[PDB]
Design a protein around this ligand. Structure first.
Ligand code: ANP
Ligand code: MG
Ligand code: ZN
Lengths: 533, 188, 195, 505, 130, 171, 258
């Protein structure tokens, strides 16, 4: 009976007295946590060992029994430093003891503190556990209560106030609960013995340790290793977790603004794109416009005006990879697609279902296709809606839905399908031996202007800050040019769907300067670059 | 002209400078009584007329200057002892709104003497460092209750230390000013 | 409308204030917006032309009691709100320059009127610093003196240098035991650290 | 126990002070009492939670933080108010002991307790909350026993008893065995009086967070809701909805002896107190709207004003705009006395050159009609466009879903012949009928069809017959009321006008 | 507000500083510790005056037009020379001319004659702070 | 409320709804058409530095001010139920400046009583997050995204004050 | 810790109705109209006529409360902040003093009806208002030791009453309530109606009364003081005879009771 009080007294005196130099680090942490309504304390093992090794010995021998005593000691201190009501505080631990590989845990480790690491592969939804709980006695209608704590219980049968063999029921109307979550940990990929699939464990956490990690992340864990019921005299193992480890500034945009006022910025960005590829000036210019895009608009009668750009390329393999690297969001694929969804989408089967290809998945970003001629039959017809409407719509086998396809397409190949693109160009080659020798020397080196990340961040900044508008001079210029080309063709086609493409290119050119208005300077280069032919 | 962080307030360095002008009691280990000090902001007679192991009173900055070397020893103030600090904590607990009557420089002087003069105390220093903390924590509770009475007119405070006031100054004055602006705007 | 350019210009004042306040060591106030200011002044000139034309129509008798009064009055407000924006922006950059003048007593971002303004204010500071009250170094340190003697380590090879107290030889990564009142200026210049 | 009485008194003071709730009680009562002498309105009232705050903060926070202790006495007081007001005499046997009190509902300013299924957390248990999401599942409606009445054969005395279950009450009571008593305390054999007993309706649903809010492709989260009495069947799957109710827990949670080592948690629910839809179509007119509509109708040329106000961002094509307006108004549907039916709804087709705003104009109808479904001609099959079999259950297609609405079909020329012929019934008989293994049924499909297509040769050829340019059978073209041909004829002033227009746009 | 300058105190203090400096030099040219105390005391004294004068000049920057208007009012109950020291008077006067020249040429040269005043009270916003 | 104050300069440029009481020639540029008159009972959205005068100068003054959406009844009920949870930053970036200007303009009594309580109740949690110093980021960062531009300055000058004191003590 | 720091007639009636009921203790002041005098008197008279009619029909307190409570909002409002309602109530009572002081039969009828109305309105109060009203009237509880010594007798006396009047059917609930209940000691002659029904415990000429009972003492004090005030009112009726314009109204008011 007295041992429960001496242990609590000891951990209480630990928190009140541990100085390193001149700051009572655990008193300060416990106070600073309460002010932001965080009811927990993060103790470090090495400090506990330094203070008194006997306390650590008791904790190391019987953790399931002693962790609750230390938690209630924290509550008793929390009241003195803040009251002249609070829940029970959660204890959290940090440690540097030797990691055990997950594959070596065995019967020698049951009910011991264990430190390990791995990859999280799954996460459950949250669930409710009881801490303070109220009871009603069915016969006499007397009432009482119980206090649960979550360490390795059932309803009692000692009836009170004969009173019967099993008379107790729960008053959910006057009881207290906490959150609980389950996780799965898989052993590290670079540890697994050859020819075997990795082993994994299941584990539990509650209160502030919940909702702290997501699938696919590598983590380190401190927790009690134990067993639970679910052959003869045999039980399943698991872990109880006690700790886990895993927009612009002003000085950034000042650089982007200095770039914006450079008189040769257009040349600089074109030079910075796939610099190993010789020649092909207009290809690089078109990729800049594809990355920057026009401006989206919405009208009073609800009609909606597209912002994206689309380009086709007829050496060429390198540019799509470069675009994939520089773009803020990107998807890469070959014409057959990643599944029976193809490029656009399809219905599959047993009940029917639907899945989207690599037009739906790239929504909001850029998508690049590596051989557009290898497009499947259904995609040949479906890409018309995907490009003109920025949607895909299906009404088959009782499915009736519409999918978003808001993206800019880059494509390459080697017909009427060319009409869907804003610009089309044919890649050109040159055969200087020095270029191949330089490439070969670099290949041997690995076997034995603006940088990508800065350019990607700049493109992001420009897309977020500016969406410019045509000046009246540009309108007169464009309309005069439009009727001039149609008249020239008539005396010897251009159509509105291409005028509205020239406008988007013009806006994308003005966007580099961050000029809020587009000007004749941009219109001239737009029509100059329009020579796809 | 003046820095932005000194427009309305004193930094802790200036607070230390202000506290350093107070007198303190010392035991010198040398006799100066029959060159002479010839100071211009203080008395000069006390330093010129020292006798070894005879108690005397000087400004704190000179006292710390001497204690840097062998030549001097500093007597702790009488409030800075275990018995008195026990009584002040009991006063703090007994009267849940009043502040106990500690001197206006208690925090600053404690954290100067514990660094420069750890050897000259009679009590064990590891207990004083605990009781000072207890006092500061209780006073912080009482402060947090008081910030629910910021108003358009005024407030009264008692026995709150200089450093404790200076810690809170830019919050109290700002919120109080805006309540005043909102109220007077409705009168006009 | 006539206030849009002002509402755009003042955002640069707010931006440069926050950039300046974030890092006291990194003061380089940005390019003066000559083009926006010129556009605002051109707008004011347009409004002046409109008021002058309206005064001609008033002298012609074109319903001048009500019509000229209301149109003139409304135009006057549009001019005043532009004056306020321009003065606010220029006053902010002036405060920054005044702050630098006290420590210093490069030029390309300042407008030429500002370039002569800074020189004028430097002359004023040295006039105050000279003459009577010279005994206290008005451009010196504002942090109270804590210690007489300190230990300082040698960060940059400036070689042999002269100072009012004497001569120093700044042998890279040597260490001095010396009075602070001497080396305060060299610490501010950045040849030394306190360790 | 005594506190219950004082809470009833305090809510009575509220009901006397804010008089707009008395008018609500009385108006429902007089309406129900009128038509009973010849539909009936529910015994339910919605209170503004703001009025209660301004009346008494101590009662407001009590309702909002301890609903199990404040909602029952408040609801009791409402019933006393409605009962003391005058009511029809000589009630029938079933009316005398209905066990049917009035019920409350809430609106306005939930503050911190306005939530979503992802963020509902164990801290919020037993609080009154508001959640938002999409309905995903609904149970069948079931009746539930709450009271039964019995007649004792010898003594001539009518007896009764009441039943409870954990989802029927906010406060907690000993559960009841659902047994009917056969014999009296005094040994008399009993009989059960159905029709005097009381049963109520019950339905469970599930609500999930909206897909627009799902993070990182992670699994979405959801809650189950309990509905009863009046709230049953007011929703269907796919509805966006906002639900108000008490968040509560249930059951023994494995502490009644189980193999789980109590790792499993307790069960939880929301008890539906009020339900509101979300607009994501319909509007309700104010008096001023009726006045403006009637006044505008007396202009000399209302048809021109209205037609030109459709898609003003599209230049030209006056006649197609007028045709679309007449389609949106429609004819009048006739049913003759012998059961014979005559069609009322207008179908329109337009075929033409590339880029001539066909798809752009077709897109406008989808955003001004009250019910509209859109599809591309090659992305849809005959069965998917009309109806399909599943498991036997029969599942509706797009033309069955838009019943009294409009269906838009783009790229109509790409639809296969096998798909087109499924439409021949729907555009005249306005029904769908299936005769397949284990099924025979007829379904209703009354919509108007509007569609766009490309001519056979890629551009319209005036030097060949219209049948050569338009490859569709005569029996299908006959079903479209208006067939429009449109082309991109090159002309200077036309080009200039259109280009200047799009640039101004 | 800007409080009135202590004219007499400053004269006496600055004279005392000069005399103490010469005394320190004479004793230095003639135990170490007394010199230590004297030197650091003079540093402590000079710091306070430096801070005080910098604060007053900062107040004069912010209320320049207000002080000028207070001086121009012939009916004022206090003269500007009562409030400020001679050095402060020089700073106020010449700094006002420097600032005035900068805005007068840059902005106000372009404004119509009704809006060319810098210290206008009658406009839709008061141009004088206090 | 100083002349050269940037925040005051910037807050006066917010637009408020207005209605005219006279037809006037040539002022159609306010309606973005310089070639036309303004006509009586037309409604427009004008910046406060202009509407504050046209509502006063005469008699009947030229413009009448309509009750703006940022002082609507829904906002007042949101304020009075839970002031600490409220996202004032989304309602309007400069709320406590415009509130005082509107109070001066119409001499409102009840609005002043609502706004005083709102400020006093939010100052509490602002001090809590100011006092809490590391020896956490998410818990603080969620509330500090709902502060006005007015409140951010008070938070910054409080946090720096506590931090400087803490640094000096433990040194 | 931090720290900061005729109209008289209206204040009089605010004070008189802070308790929500009054013994009608004090002389009214200022003026009202003669139409108001007649109408206010008739309104209170209608309520008291219905109270006497129901009592002559031998109806219970609950039935009378169901009958009379809807009439307050029309004739004589209660639980109200309105100065007009408060003046109407106060003045109407004082007017009917002058109408019903005239004879022993009229005094008895008026005292009976007004005391029953007092009982009704007291039942409408919250327990806090009842406590404050009783405390405002300057109205001996026994010691805990005396309660312990007499606990068996007191519990035997009140146990049935706790079950029937407070619905405490469980003996456990009765014991808990009795442990929390206070008792009053006074001479048995003061509560003789409870004595005749054996609802109080008697010892040495003193009756022991639980706190949840004893409202009959309050209403009896109201009735007794009203009777004495009516006797006084009767003695100075010759001063009422100086304004003739009031006597027809008072004759009309009394005629409905004769
Ligand atoms: N007045 C107009 N006349 C013609 N086209 C216009 C007009 N105004 C805009 N457009 C544009 O014309 C383009 C093509 O319109 P759209 O409706 O897709 O043509 P379409 O008839 O569907 N051509 P298609 O998809 O090849 O069958 C869009 O980008 C419209 O914005
Ligand atoms: Mg199209
Ligand atoms: Zn029992």
């Amino acid at each position: 009976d007295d041992d429960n009080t001496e242990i609590i007294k000891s951990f209480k005196n630990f928190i009140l007295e541990f100085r390193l130099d001149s700051q009572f680090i655990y008193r300060d942490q416990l106070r600073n946590n309460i002010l932001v309504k965080n009811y927990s304390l993060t103790v470090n093992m090495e400090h506990l060992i330094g203070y008194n090794e006997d306390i650590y010995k008791k904790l190391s021998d019987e953790p399931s029994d002693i962790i609750p005593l230390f938690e209630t000691a924290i509550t008793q201190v929390a009241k003195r430093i803040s009251i002249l009501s609070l829940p029970t505080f959660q204890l959290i631990l940090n440690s540097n003891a030797n990691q055990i590989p997950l594959r070596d845990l065995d019967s020698e480790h049951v009910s011991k503190i264990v430190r390990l690491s791995g990859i999280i592969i799954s996460t459950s939804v949250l669930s409710s556990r009881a801490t303070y709980l109220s009871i009603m006695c069915r016969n006499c209608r007397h009432t009482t209560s119980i206090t649960i704590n979550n360490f390795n219980v059932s309803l009692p049968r000692s009836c009170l106030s004969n009173c019967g063999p099993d008379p107790y029921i729960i008053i959910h109307e006057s009881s207290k609960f906490i959150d609980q979550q389950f996780l799965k940990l898989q052993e590290i990929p670079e540890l697994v013995p050859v020819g075997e699939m990795p082993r994994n464990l299941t584990m539990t956490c509650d209160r502030y340790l919940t909702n702290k990690v997501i699938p696919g992340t590598r983590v380190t864990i401190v927790g009690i290793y134990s067993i639970y019921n679910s052959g003869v005299a045999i039980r399943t193992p698991y872990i109880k977790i006690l700790g886990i480890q895993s927009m612009f500034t002003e000085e950034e945009e000042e650089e982007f603004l200095q770039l914006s006022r450079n008189p040769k910025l257009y040349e600089i960005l074109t030079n910075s794109i796939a610099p190993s590829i010789f020649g092909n000036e207009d290809i690089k210019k078109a990729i800049v416009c594809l990355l920057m895009g026009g401006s989206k608009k919405i009208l009073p009668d609800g009609m909606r005006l597209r912002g994206d750009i689309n380009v086709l390329l007829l050496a060429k393999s390198q540019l799509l990879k470069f675009v994939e690297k520089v773009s803020p969001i990107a998807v890469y694929t070959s014409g057959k697609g990643s599944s029976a969804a193809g490029l656009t989408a399809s219905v599959q089967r047993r009940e029917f279902y639907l899945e989207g290809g690599a037009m739906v998945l790239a929504d909001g970003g850029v998508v690049c296709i590596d051989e557009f001629d290898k497009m499947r039959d259904e995609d040949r017809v479906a890409i018309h809606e995907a490009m003109e409407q920025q949607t895909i719509s299906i009404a088959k086998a009782g499915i009736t839905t519409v999918l978003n396809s808001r993206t800019s397409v880059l494509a390459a190949a080697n017909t009427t399908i060319l009409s869907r693109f804003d610009m089309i160009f044919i890649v050109k080659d040159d055969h200087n031996e020095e270029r191949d020798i330089s490439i070969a020397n670099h290949v041997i080196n690995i076997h034995t202007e603006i940088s990508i990340e800065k350019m990607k961040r700049y493109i992001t900044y420009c897309r977020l800050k500016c969406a410019p508008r045509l000046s009246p001079q540009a309108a007169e210029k464009l309309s005069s040019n439009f009727v001039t080309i149609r008249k020239q063709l008539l005396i010897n086609p251009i159509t509105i769907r291409q005028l509205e493409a020239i406008i988007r290119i013009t806006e994308s050119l003005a966007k580099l300067e961050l000029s809020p208005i587009a000007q004749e300077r941009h219109v001239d280069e737009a029509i100059r670059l329009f020579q796809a032919s | 002209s003046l820095p932005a962080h000194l427009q309305q307030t004193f930094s802790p360095e200036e607070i230390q400078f202000i506290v350093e002008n107070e007198p303190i009691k010392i035991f010198p280990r040398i006799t100066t009584r029959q060159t002479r000090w010839q100071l211009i902001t203080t008395d000069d007679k006390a330093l010129n007329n020292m006798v070894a192991m005879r108690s005397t009173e000087v400004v704190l900055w000179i006292a710390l200057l001497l204690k840097q070397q062998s030549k001097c020893s500093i007597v702790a103030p009488q409030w800075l002892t275990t018995k008195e600090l026990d009584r002040k904590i009991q006063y703090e607990k007994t009267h849940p709104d009043r502040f106990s009557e500690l001197p206006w420089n208690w925090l600053v002087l404690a954290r100067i003497l514990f660094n420069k003069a750890k050897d000259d105390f009679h009590d064990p220093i590891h207990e004083l460092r605990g009781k000072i903390q207890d006092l500061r924590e209780i006073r912080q509770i009482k402060v947090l209750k008081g910030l629910k009475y910021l108003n358009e007119s005024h407030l009264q405070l008692d026995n709150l230390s200089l450093l404790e006031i200076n810690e809170l100054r830019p919050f109290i004055t700002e919120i109080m000013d805006k309540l005043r602006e909102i109220h007077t705007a409705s009168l006009t | 409308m006539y206030g849009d350019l002002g509402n755009k210009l003042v955002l640069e004042a707010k931006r440069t204030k926050q950039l300046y306040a974030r890092s006291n060591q990194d003061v380089n106030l940005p390019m003066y917006h000559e083009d926006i200011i010129r556009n605002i002044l051109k707008e004011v000139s347009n409004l002046r032309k409109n008021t002058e034309y309206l005064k001609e129509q008033q002298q012609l008798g074109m319903l001048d009691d009500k019509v000229a009064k209301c149109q003139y009055f409304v135009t006057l407000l549009c001019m005043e709100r532009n004056k306020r924006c321009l003065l606010a922006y220029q006053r902010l950059r002036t405060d920054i320059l005044d702050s630098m003048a006290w420590n210093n007593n490069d030029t390309n971002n300042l407008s030429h009127q500002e370039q002569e303004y800074l020189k004028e204010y430097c002359d004023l500071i040295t006039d105050l610093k000279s003459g009577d009250l010279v005994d206290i170094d008005l451009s010196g340190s504002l942090v109270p003196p804590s210690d007489v003697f300190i230990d300082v380590r040698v960060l940059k090879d400036a070689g042999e240098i002269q100072t009012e107290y004497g001569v120093f030889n700044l042998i890279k990564d040597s260490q001095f035991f010396v009075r602070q009142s001497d080396v305060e200026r060299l610490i501010q210049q950045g040849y030394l650290q306190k360790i | 126990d005594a506190v219950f009485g004082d809470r009833v008194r305090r809510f009575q003071e509220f009901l006397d002070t804010f008089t707009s709730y008395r008018d609500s009680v009385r108006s429902i009562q007089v309406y129900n009492s009128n038509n009973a002498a010849n539909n009936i309105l529910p015994h339910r009232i919605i209170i503004s939670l703001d009025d209660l705050r301004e009346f008494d903060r101590s009662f407001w926070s009590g309702i909002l933080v301890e609903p199990a202790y404040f909602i029952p006495p408040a609801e009791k007081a409402l019933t006393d108010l409605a009962d003391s007001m005058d009511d029809v005499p000589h009630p029938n046997a079933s009316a005398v002991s209905s066990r049917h009190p009035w019920k409350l509902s809430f609106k306005g300013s939930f503050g911190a307790h306005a939530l979503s299924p992802r963020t509902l957390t164990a801290q919020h248990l037993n609080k009154l909350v508001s959640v938002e999401g999409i309905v995903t599942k609904t149970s069948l409606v079931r009746p539930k026993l709450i009271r039964s009445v019995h007649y004792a054969a010898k003594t001539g005395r009518f007896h009764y008893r009441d039943y409870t279950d954990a989802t029927t009450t906010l406060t907690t009571r000993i559960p009841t065995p659902a047994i009917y008593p056969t014999e009296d305390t005094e040994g008399n054999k009993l009989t059960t009086e159905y029709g005097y007993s009381t049963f109520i309706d019950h339905q469970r649903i599930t609500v999930q967070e909206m897909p627009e809010m799902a993070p990182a492709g992670q699994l979405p989260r959801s809650i189950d809701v309990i509905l009863d009495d009046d709230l049953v069947d007011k929703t269907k799957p796919g509805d966006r909805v906002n639900v108000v109710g008490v968040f509560k827990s249930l059951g023994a949670g494995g502490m009644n002896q189980s193999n789980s080592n109590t790792l499993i948690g307790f069960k939880t629910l929301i008890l539906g107190n009020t339900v509101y839809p979300l607009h994501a179509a319909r509007q309700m007119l104010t008096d001023f709207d009726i006045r403006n509509i009637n006044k505008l109708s007396k202009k000399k040329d209302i048809f021109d004003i209205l037609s030109q106000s459709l898609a003003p961002s599209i230049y030209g094509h006056d006649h197609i705009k007028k045709a679309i307006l007449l389609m949106l108004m429609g004819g009048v549907e006739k049913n003759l006395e012998n059961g014979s039916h005559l069609r009322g709804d207008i179908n329109i087709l337009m075929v033409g050159d590339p880029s001539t705003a066909k798809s752009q104009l077709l897109r406008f109808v989808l955003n001004t009609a009250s019910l509209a479904i859109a599809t591309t001609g090659r992305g849809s099959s005959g069965v998917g466009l009309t109806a399909a079999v599943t498991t036997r259950r029969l599942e509706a297609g797009a033309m069955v879903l838009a019943d009294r609405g409009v269906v838009c079909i783009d790229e109509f020329d790409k639809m296969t012949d096998v798909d087109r012929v499924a439409i021949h019934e729907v555009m005249e008989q306005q029904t769908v009928t299936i005769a397949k293994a284990g099924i025979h049924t007829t379904l209703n499909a009354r919509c108007s069809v509007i569609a766009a297509a490309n001519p056979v040769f890629g551009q319209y050829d005036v030097n060949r017959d219209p049948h050569q340019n338009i490859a569709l059978p005569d029996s299908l073209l006959s079903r479209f009321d208006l067939l429009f041909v449109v082309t991109d004829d090159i002309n200077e002033i036309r080009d200039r006008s259109i280009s200047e227009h799009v640039l101004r746009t | 507000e800007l409080l009135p300058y202590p004219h007499q105190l400053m004269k006496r203090l600055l004279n005392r500083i000069s005399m103490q400096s010469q005394l320190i030099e004479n004793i230095s040219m003639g135990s170490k510790l007394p010199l230590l105390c004297m030197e650091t005391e003079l540093e402590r004294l000079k710091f306070v005056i430096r801070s005080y004068i910098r604060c007053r000049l900062s107040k004069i920057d912010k209320f320049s037009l207000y002080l000028r208007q207070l001086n121009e009012d012939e009916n004022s109950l206090i003269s500007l020379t009562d409030l400020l020291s001679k050095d402060e008077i020089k700073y106020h006067d010449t700094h006002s001319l420097i600032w005035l020249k900068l805005v007068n040429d840059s902005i106000l040269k372009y404004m119509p004659e009704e809006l060319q005043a810098i210290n206008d009270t009658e406009g839709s916003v008061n141009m004088i702070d206090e | 409320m100083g002349y050269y104050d940037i925040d005051d300069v910037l807050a006066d440029g917010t637009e408020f709804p207005c209605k005219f009481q006279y037809d006037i020639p040539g002022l159609g540029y306010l309606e973005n058409n310089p070639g036309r008159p303004i006509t009586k009972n037309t409604k427009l959205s004008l910046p406060l530095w202009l509407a504050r005068i046209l509502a006063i100068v005469g008699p009947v003054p030229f413009v009448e001010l309509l009750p703006p959406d940022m002082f609507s009844t829904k906002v007042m009920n949101a304020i009075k139920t839970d002031p600490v949870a409220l996202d004032l930053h989304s309602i309007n970036s400069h709320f406590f400046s415009l509130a005082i200007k509107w109070i001066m303009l119409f001499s409102e009594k009840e609005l002043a009583n609502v706004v005083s309580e709102l400020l006093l109740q939010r100052a509490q949690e602002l001090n809590h997050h100011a006092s809490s110093l590391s020896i956490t980021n998410i818990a603080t960062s969620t509330f500090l995204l709902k502060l006005e531009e007015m409140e951010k300055e008070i938070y910054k000058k409080s946090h720096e004050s506590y931090k400087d004191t803490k640094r000096w003590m433990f040194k | 810790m931090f720290r900061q720091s005729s109209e008289e007639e209206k204040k009089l009636y605010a004070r008189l109705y802070e308790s929500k009921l009054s013994f009608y203790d004090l002389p009214p002041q200022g003026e009202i109209t003669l139409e108001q005098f007649e109408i206010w008197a008739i309104d209170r008279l209608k309520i008291l006529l219905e109270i006497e009619s129901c009592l002559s029909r031998n109806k219970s307190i609950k039935e009378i409360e169901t009958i009379i409570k809807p009439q307050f909002q029309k004739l004589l409002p209660f639980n109200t902040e309105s100065l007009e309602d408060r003046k109407k109530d106060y003045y109407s009572h004082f007017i009917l003093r002058l109408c019903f002081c005239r004879s022993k039969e009229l005094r008895e009828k008026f005292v009976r009806a007004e005391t029953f109305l007092f009982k009704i309105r007291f039942n409408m109060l919250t327990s806090t208002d009842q406590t404050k009203f009783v405390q405002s009237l300057d109205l001996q509880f026994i010691s805990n030791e005396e309660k312990a010594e007499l606990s068996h007798q007191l519990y035997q006396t009140v146990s049935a009453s706790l079950q029937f009047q407070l619905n405490l059917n469980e003996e456990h609930q009765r014991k808990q309530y009795f442990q929390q209940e206070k008792f009053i000691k006074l001479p048995f002659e003061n509560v003789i109606e409870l004595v005749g029904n054996r609802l109080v415990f008697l010892k040495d000429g003193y009756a022991y009364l639980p706190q949840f009972q004893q409202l009959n003492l309050l209403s009896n004090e109201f009735a007794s003081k009203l009777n004495q005030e009516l006797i006084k009112t009767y003695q100075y009726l010759p001063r009422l005879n100086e304004d003739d314009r009031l006597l027809p109204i008072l004759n009309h008011l009394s005629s409905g009771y004769t």
